TrEMBL record:
It comes from the Bacteria. This is Esterase D. InterPro entries: AB_hydrolase_fold, Esterase_lipase, Hydrolase_4. Coiled coil: none annotated. It comes from Lacticaseibacillus rhamnosus HN001. The active site is at S92 (nucleophile), D186 (charge relay system), H217 (charge relay system).
Amino acid sequence: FRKPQPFEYEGTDTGVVLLHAYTGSPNDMNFMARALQRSGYGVYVPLFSGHGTVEPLDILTKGNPDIWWAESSAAVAHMTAKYAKVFVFGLSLGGIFAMKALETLPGITAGGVFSSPILPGKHHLVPGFLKYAEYMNRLAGKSDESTQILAYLPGQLAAIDQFATTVAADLNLVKQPTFIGQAGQDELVDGRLAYQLRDALINAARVDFHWYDDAKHVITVNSAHHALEEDVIAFMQQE
């Protein structure tokens, strides 16, 4: 099994921070990052604590939203020191942190979310996590771990939501152009709620909203990802 590392591509004028999903990793962003590289952008994809090991508990015991928010904000600072212009995008978990960056951190031109409505809702992250843990354990030949996972998972999902609601409450503070991409057959979060993310952004310079009709959640990797790439790059060019 291979631990995904953080990775960076050098650019010239404009740089992009890509923040990955819960139970995900920098691999979430492999196509996207490279799409951006082919169009001359710099790209940085950090790894969130707890993520990217063979052991799913590490996410629950070594990571939390406050740590991941520090790491997101360090990743933005890395890039804003370097590039004239910096965009920040995030998938699911990473999207929350991307929107909080736009709300609270200096020096960002624009940014947005892939499949991350922010507003907490009806989600399927409990089955998703366990299924993930189940695959990872099968892979490593480690005995099921569902019981110890269920001692933490509710807790950490709660902390995520709590973090999210603060971000939702501060959506009024966003003045930047904001990209929203949402999967149209999202099996993990409630895509509906992306329309409400749209409507809450009452002070944003624009909101560029896209809906990817037949795609499941991880639209950075699945069949939507070519369209998503086109749309994100057209978004950035427009600004």
